[PDB]
Design a protein around this ligand. Structure first.
Ligand code: CTP
Length: 367
RNA sequence: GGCCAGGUAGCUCAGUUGGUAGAGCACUGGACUGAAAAUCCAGGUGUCGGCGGUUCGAUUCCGCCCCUGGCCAC
């Protein structure tokens, strides 16, 4: 209905950005970004009015948001910078060629993909390429983004883009960039399933050294990351109903050798979940003694007592040890699964003493 | 949209190793009164946001959502 309203208003609207990319990548999303020549606000208001839904105008930004079903629609007036601006000017201010394309929703040309910079080719050639040499200097945050994209889509940086990125990092522009944008970029990164490769790119171009203070790369951490990769694979395979956020575990592995102050401060800046902070504070101190206790474990009930109160993250961190692996697994798919019939429990019940007795019965069954 | 709190009676507020819930003023009833209030005995003072899951058992552990306030990314 967008093309119709755009025709009535004598306007030109286009689908724009990553939304197009995901479309060309076959990935359907519920968030659509529009660029409108002419007023986007009135377009959004009219579209929201016809479908009879609420509208959220932003006059100063020149954009408007409206939700139809599960579809989240954003209309944005064309602008040459972050006189009426052409679509091309609105596209050229963006980051990479694959994010620089557009698809026309106007009824006459409808279905047409508009690519000025050859983003279609780079998408076809699996290439992450900047629109202009000054791109990374304009927005240093993009330094992460590229890598992140190169992580997700398994693309490669062009020689140009790569040299420009290295030059950008060497200038220390990563420190000059706003802390919030970078931290948010990392938060976006860890949510990726391919985020490990993104970390490989972070190590390769050494951006984490700039972002995180006191952080350095070694082999033990990397091997820990790949071991954690395997553990995450298995856990998300068999136990997949129990899944949690995995990237935070990698993030914990990275900052493990860091001081507790810088770690707590970083997790503070990252707005990490509570279980993440707890798992970290537990890892830095009590984890060692916990492992030493698991080594002294003989009966299965001791393993129970030492494990069951812990979160899943702590267990997945305990699976990093070769000797404790099969033990953790044994606790997972077997040990903690059991029950009791009616009459027996009725005899068990005849306060906290009921719980103690039940514990005695469990340790009676195990061993 | 991300996160941090906050969600406890009508209102204003505390509560951790999961194990049988609390204060200050309104609420009912009776004793009291010509009526009423005060006051005494007392006792409602609550599925401690909503829905699932784990657990013998969840205000607590976790997950998905509702609401309010604040940091932001917008
Ligand atoms: N410094 C920046 C940041 C963003 N952009 C452009 O603005 C858009 C911001 O939308 P975003 O959601 O960040 O990009 P997506 O490809 O949609 O990524 P995702 O779908 O993962 O959100 C991007 O497409 C990018 O082309 C840019 O030109 N310069």
């Amino acid at each position: 209905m967008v093309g119709q309203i755009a025709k009535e208003m004598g306007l030109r609207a286009y689908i724009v950005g990553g939304v197009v990319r995901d479309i060309l990548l076959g990935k359907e999303v519920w968030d659509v970004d529009f660029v409108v020549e002419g007023n986007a606000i009135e377009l959004a208001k009219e579209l929201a009015r016809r479908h009879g839904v609420n509208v959220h105008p932003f006059p100063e930004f020149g954009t408007a948001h409206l939700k139809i079903g599960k579809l989240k629609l954003e209309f944005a007036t064309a602008r040459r910078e972050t006189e009426p601006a052409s679509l091309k000017e609105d596209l050229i201010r963006r980051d990479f060629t694959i994010n620089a394309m557009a698809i026309s929703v106007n009824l006459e040309d409808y279905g047409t993909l508009i690519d000025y910079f050859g983003g279609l080719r780079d998408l076809k050639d699996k290439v992450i390429r900047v629109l202009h040499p000054v791109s990374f200097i304009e927005d240093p945050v993009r330094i992460l983004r590229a890598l992140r994209f190169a992580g997700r889509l398994n693309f490669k940086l062009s020689r140009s883009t790569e040299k420009l990125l290295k030059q950008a990092v060497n200038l220390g522009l990563l420190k000059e960039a706003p802390r919030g944008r970078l931290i948010n970029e990392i938060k976006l990164a860890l949510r990726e399933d391919r985020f490990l490769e993104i970390l490989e790119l972070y190590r390769k171009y050494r951006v984490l050294e700039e972002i995180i203070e006191g952080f350095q790369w070694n082999e033990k951490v990397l091997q820990k990351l790949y071991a954690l990769r395997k553990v995450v694979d298995w856990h998300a395979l068999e136990f997949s109903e129990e899944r949690i956020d995995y990237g935070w575990l990698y993030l914990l592995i990275l900052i493990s050798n860091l001081d507790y102050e810088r770690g707590k401060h970083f997790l503070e800046e990252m707005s990490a979940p509570s279980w993440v902070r707890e798992t970290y504070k537990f890892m830095k101190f009590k984890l060692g003694s916990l492992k030493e206790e698991l080594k002294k474990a003989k009966e299965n009930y001791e393993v129970y007592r030492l494990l069951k109160p812990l979160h899943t993250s702590v267990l997945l961190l305990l699976m990093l040890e070769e000797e404790l692996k099969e033990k953790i697994k044994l606790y997972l798919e077997k040990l903690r699964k059991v029950k009791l019939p009616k009459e027996k429990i009725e005899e068990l019940k005849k306060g906290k003493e009921l719980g103690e007795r039940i514990e005695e019965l469990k340790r009676e069954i195990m061993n």
